[PDB]
Amino acid sequence: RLQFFVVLTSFPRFPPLAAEVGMARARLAQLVRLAGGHCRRDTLWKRLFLGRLALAELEELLEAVHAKSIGDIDPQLDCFLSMTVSWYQSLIKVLLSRFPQSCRHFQSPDLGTQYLVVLNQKFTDCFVLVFLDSHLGKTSLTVVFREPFPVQLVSTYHHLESVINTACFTLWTRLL
Amino acid sequence: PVEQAVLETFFSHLGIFSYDKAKDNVEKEREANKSAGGSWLSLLAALAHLAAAEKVYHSLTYLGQKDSIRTIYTSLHNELKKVVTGRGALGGTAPHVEELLSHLSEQLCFFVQARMEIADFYEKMYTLSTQKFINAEELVGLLDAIMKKYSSRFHHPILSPLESSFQLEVDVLCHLLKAQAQVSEWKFLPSLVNLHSAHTKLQTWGQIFEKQPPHLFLWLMKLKNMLLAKFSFYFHEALSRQTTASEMKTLTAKANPDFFGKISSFIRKYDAANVSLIFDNRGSESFQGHGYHHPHSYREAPKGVDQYPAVVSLPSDRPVMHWPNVIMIMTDRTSDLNSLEKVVHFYDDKVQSTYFLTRPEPHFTIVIIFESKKSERDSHFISFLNEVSLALKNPKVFASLKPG
């Protein structure tokens, strides 16, 4: 419940008042709706970065956030698009076994996918996600930032290199 | 057509490295039925001759020979061209196919030309084998020229196996050759990518032994094993971070030549102080560290000591108090090191810092440090360094390009 006042100023010597009142009401209503729809994303992001992150609920942030696929950002890292699903399983096992709390988990309970995203403890917004759905035959690597990116990038490429390091390491082991 | 069965035997049976079972019936399919027409006889004889020629070609025994594959293949094109002619009459198979195989014969002549030029390239490579060090970028360019010259001009359905098989090996060589460059140029990621691509393509090309393989098969496995061992030795410190002190040992105790295993076993042979391989990276500015970084990442430039780093320094770290004494000899007496053969000796006052030197490659060197001055370890370090240089060059495989 909010109370709003509308003034119209500019020596003593209305339809415009009604029109301005209506336009202001519409603008504030749409702004309130947008703010309500956008604050949920920020709150869920804060909760996830801090724990009680429901796997079926975290998908809402992915729908809201405009994550960028690895193929889009750089072509040199395009051959990874040809890696088999088992390679992704090996990668997930390796980083989950080795890496500390800086890697989170999100798995579909029954016959679904799993997410073992890794985000730097300080690099907010920007994060790395691992899509692995053997049932649908869909494996995707995308960079997820919690804000539209005009294209920050220094830290974004920092942990990106730190993450891609393990990907070659897993591929090196399979090449051994 | 009736001959479709014979063609689908000969082709798609030659592709599994099996030649005699179809070369025997190539003449049978034309001699059992004496009456024939068109090319249904000359084509079969040329097919048997081509099977024998390809068997000789994948024998690899025609190297140097101080008859050649070029001599055999010169008549191979004619044996198909003569059959694929405007034979209007006096034969007779069908006045809708008749020749039919004229396009296939032109495709096979183009494939014969490709085989001959690949054999010539391989013979030139074998000639380069005796060299101390052979560059790879120009050979890569020549092979890519061969690719462009012989790409997508000879494919018909029945030729799908051959077109693949041949191509597979060739691109594998490309993936090897670039890797040989990228390994020599320290290009970690491109070399790894090429290695994986070549391994994947080989795991398809060389899969006829279950469902003896020719000499080029074992030769390419030997080359790949040497390449991956070189990759493991060159790029070891970065990968050693994402593992423990034992998993790396298990991983590196499998790939031959086992450079890491030999180094670990020979460190205690003299209780030395440091073993470090230095990379001569001068002339380039893309160097930023041991790992991967985003392409457009602004970095600094090397200067002085950083010009010559100890990337694989062992067992603990490179020394920062004796490094000046060994950094300045990389260009003072390095004339004999440039021959990729000599070994350096040194001796200090009130200190036993004595460094050796081996130069397997112009951009690579081994500068093994010892803290003794007694008897130079009976010149065993020089022999070990020479063996290491030979293994890193690995010209033994290129000499074994000929069978035996």
A171 vs B196, B254, B293: nearest CB: B196
C-alpha–C-alpha distance, residues B79 and B367, integer Å: 60
Best B242, B247, B260 member to test A by mutation, with max A CBs in 10 Å, is B242
Sheet holding B358-361, edge to edge: B277-279, B364-366, B358-361
Alpha carbon of B105 to those of A48, B41, B46: distances in Å?
67, 14, 10
Alpha carbon of A175 to those of A47, B243, B335: distances in Å?
39, 16, 38
- What DSSP letter does each residue of B242-282 carry, written as one string? TS-TTHHHHHHTSSSS-HHHHHHHHHTTTT-SBB-EEE--T
Question: Residues with Cβ < 8 Å from B254, sequence gap 6 or more?
Answer: A176
What residues of chain A lie within 8 A of the CB of B293, using their CB?
157, 161
Two tokens, residue A44: 């869920």
What residues of chain B lie within 8 A of the CB of A172, using their CB?
192, 239
Which is it for the CA torsion A157, A159, A162, A164, positive or negative?
Answer: negative
A74 vs B188, B193, B295: nearest CB: B295
For residue A30, give how far its alpha carbon lies from the nearest alpha carbon of chain B (Å): 41
What residues of chain B lie within 8 A of the CB of A170, using their CB?
none
Instruction: Specify the DSSP element, H or E, that contains B299.
Output: none
| Experimental approach | cryo-EM
Q: Do B280 and B363 meet the contact criterion of CB atoms below 8 Å apart? A: yes
C-alpha–C-alpha distance, residues B208 and B204, integer Å: 9
C-alpha–C-alpha distance, residues A85 and A139, integer Å: 7
Q: Does the beta-carbon distance from A165 to B228 stay under 8 Å?
A: no
Q: Does the beta-carbon distance from B192 to A172 stay under 8 Å?
A: yes
Two tokens, residue A103: 């890697």
CB-neighbour burial class of residue B177 (10 A; exposed 0-12, middle 13-18, buried 19+): buried
In chain B, which residues touch A (CB < 8 A)? 188-189, 192-193, 195-197, 199, 228, 238-239, 242-243, 251, 254-255, 291-295, 297
Rg (CA), chain B: 27
C-alpha–C-alpha distance, residues B62 and B69, integer Å: 7
CB pairs under 8 A between A and B: 43
C-alpha–C-alpha distance, residues B177 and B220, integer Å: 11
Bridge-partner residues for B370, per DSSP?
B354
Rg (CA), chain A: 23
- Residue that has been written with the tokens 């090397």 in this structure: B302
Q: Do B40 and B3 meet the contact criterion of CB atoms below 8 Å apart? A: yes
What does chain A come to in residues? Answer: 176
For residue A121, count other CB atoms closer than 10 A to its CB: 10
C-alpha–C-alpha distance, residues B188 and B194, integer Å: 10
B195 vs A76, A160, A175: nearest CB: A175
B291 vs A79, A161, A175: nearest CB: A161
Two tokens, residue B277: 């391989």
Instruction: Specify the DSSP element, H or E, that contains B157.
Output: none
Q: Does the beta-carbon distance from B192 to A166 stay under 8 Å?
A: no
Two tokens, residue B378: 């009976």
* A142 three-state secondary structure: strand
Q: Does the beta-carbon distance from A165 to B195 stay under 8 Å?
A: no
3-state secondary structure chain B: CCCHHHHHHHCCCHHHCCCHHHHHHHHHHHHCCCCCCCCCCHHHHHHHHHHHHHHHHCCCCCCCCCCCHHHHHHHHHHHHHHHCCCCCCCCCCCCCCCCCCHHHHHHHHHHHHHHHHHHHHHHHHHHHHCCCCCCCHHHHHHHHHHHHHCCCCCCCHHHHHHHHHHHHHHHHHHHHHHHHHHHHCCCHHHHHHHHHHHHHHHHHHCCCCCCCCCHHHHHHHHHHHHHHHHHHHHCCHHHHHCCCCCHHHHHHCCCCCCHHHHHHHHHCCCCCCEECEEECCCCCCCCCCCCCCCCCCCCCCCCHHHHCCECCCECCCCCCCCHHHHHHHHCCCHHHHCCCCCCCCCCCCCCCEEECCEEEECCEEECCEEECCCCHHHHHHHHHHHHHHHHHHCHHHHHCCCCC
Bridge-partner residues for A142, per DSSP?
A69, A129
Q: After which residues is chain A broken (C to N over 2.5 A)?
A: 10, 13, 50, 151
For residue B296, give how far its alpha carbon lies from the nearest alpha carbon of chain A (Å): 10
Task: Indicate the resolution in Å.
Answer: 3.2
Q: Helices B69-83 and B102-129, interaxial angle, to 10°? A: 170
Give the ranges where B91-136 is alpha helix by DSSP (H): 102-129
What residues of chain B lie within 8 A of the CB of A159, using their CB?
none
C-alpha–C-alpha distance, residues B60 and B69, integer Å: 10
For residue B251, give how far its alpha carbon lies from the nearest alpha carbon of chain A (Å): 7
What residues of chain A lie within 8 A of the CB of B193, using their CB?
79
Nearest CA in chain B to A95: B242
For residue A2, give how far its alpha carbon lies from the nearest alpha carbon of chain B (Å): 50
Nearest CA in chain A to B239: A169
Q: Does the beta-carbon distance from B192 to A171 stay under 8 Å?
A: yes
A76 vs B199, B255, B295: nearest CB: B295
Q: Does the beta-carbon distance from B193 to A79 stay under 8 Å?
A: yes
Q: Would you give the DSSP letter of residue A110?
A: T
Q: Do A126 and A49 meet the contact criterion of CB atoms below 8 Å apart? A: no
Q: Does the beta-carbon distance from A165 to B292 stay under 8 Å?
A: yes
Q: Do B111 and B165 meet the contact criterion of CB atoms below 8 Å apart? A: no
